[PDB]
Amino acid sequence: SKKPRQKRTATKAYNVTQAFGRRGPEQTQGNFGDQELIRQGTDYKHWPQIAQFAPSASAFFGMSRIGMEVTPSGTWLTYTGAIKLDDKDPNFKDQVILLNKHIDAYKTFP
Amino acid sequence: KPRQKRTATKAYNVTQAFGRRGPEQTQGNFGDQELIRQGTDYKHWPQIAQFAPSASAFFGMSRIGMEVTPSGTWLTYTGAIKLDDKDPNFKDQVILLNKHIDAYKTFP
Numbered sequence: 001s002k003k004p005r006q007k008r009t010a011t012k013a014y015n016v017t018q019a020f021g022r023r024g025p026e027q028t029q030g031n032f033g034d035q036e037l038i039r040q041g042t043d044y045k046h047w048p049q050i051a052q053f054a055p056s057a058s059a060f061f062g063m064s065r066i067g068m069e070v071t072p073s074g075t076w077l078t079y080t081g082a083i084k085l086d087d088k089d090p091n092f093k094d095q096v097i098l099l100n101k102h103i104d105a106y107k108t109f110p
Numbered sequence: 111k112p113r114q115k116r117t118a119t120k121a122y123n124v125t126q127a128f129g130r131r132g133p134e135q136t137q138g139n140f141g142d143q144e145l146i147r148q149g150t151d152y153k154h155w156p157q158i159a160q161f162a163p164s165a166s167a168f169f170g171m172s173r174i175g176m177e178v179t180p181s182g183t184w185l186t187y188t189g190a191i192k193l194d195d196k197d198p199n200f201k202d203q204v205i206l207l208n209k210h211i212d213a214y215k216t217f218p
């Protein structure tokens with residue numbers, strides 16, 4: 001509470017589930033994080049290699065398709081986009097692996 | 111810098127950093143001419159940035175995917191961020207966002 005969801009920072013004391021809800025399949029529900037990342041948030045020891053893909057505020061509003069939806073639950077800013085991985089980075093294969101490790105990982109555990 | 115880490119300013123504007131506004135899948139659609147020219151130097155930039163996610167929230171709130179396409183591998187993201195209708199500034203936020211969403215459709 002108090003901090004708007006989008007400005008929260010997950011850590012061990014206030015983790016991904018607590019800040020952003022349980023992972024799952026539903027449309028506006030987050031799907032990213034294995035058990036380790038869920039429990040640790042930005043305390044995850046490989047967090048920097050994930051965060052390198054997160055957009056600056058400028059890039060979020062510069063790159064994304066932004067929209068607004070007014071529904072019975074309130075007014076929502078929608079966003080969609082895509083960020084290209086740098087295939088010239090020697091760490092590219094590892095980046096693909098790390099991201100894929102967390103995408104839909106929740107399917108494998110309660 | 112990697113596109114996602116760029117910061118648009120008067121010196122390096124939204125077009126220069128993030129491409130022309132348009133309808134295409136990997137084009138941005140946000141910003142009127144003033145915001146495009148000024149980026150984070152825009153007078154109401156803070157009132158826009160309040161909606162941008164932290165890195166933690168970006169990966170926490172979003173639906174993330176990975177797509178292999180002819181040009182390479184892309185991290186996809188989508189989600190929704192709720193406005194606080196109890197915020198005294200709510201009506202002003204709606205106006206500001208409406209001013210910038212798809213503004214490019216009206217440009218000369």
Ligand SMILES: Nc1nc2ccc(OC(F)(F)F)cc2s1
Binds near residue numbers: 083
């Ligand atoms: N559900 C989705 N399918 C796709 C396919 C391609 C795409 O473009 C990209 F740039 F990411 F490659 C984005 C998406 S989101």
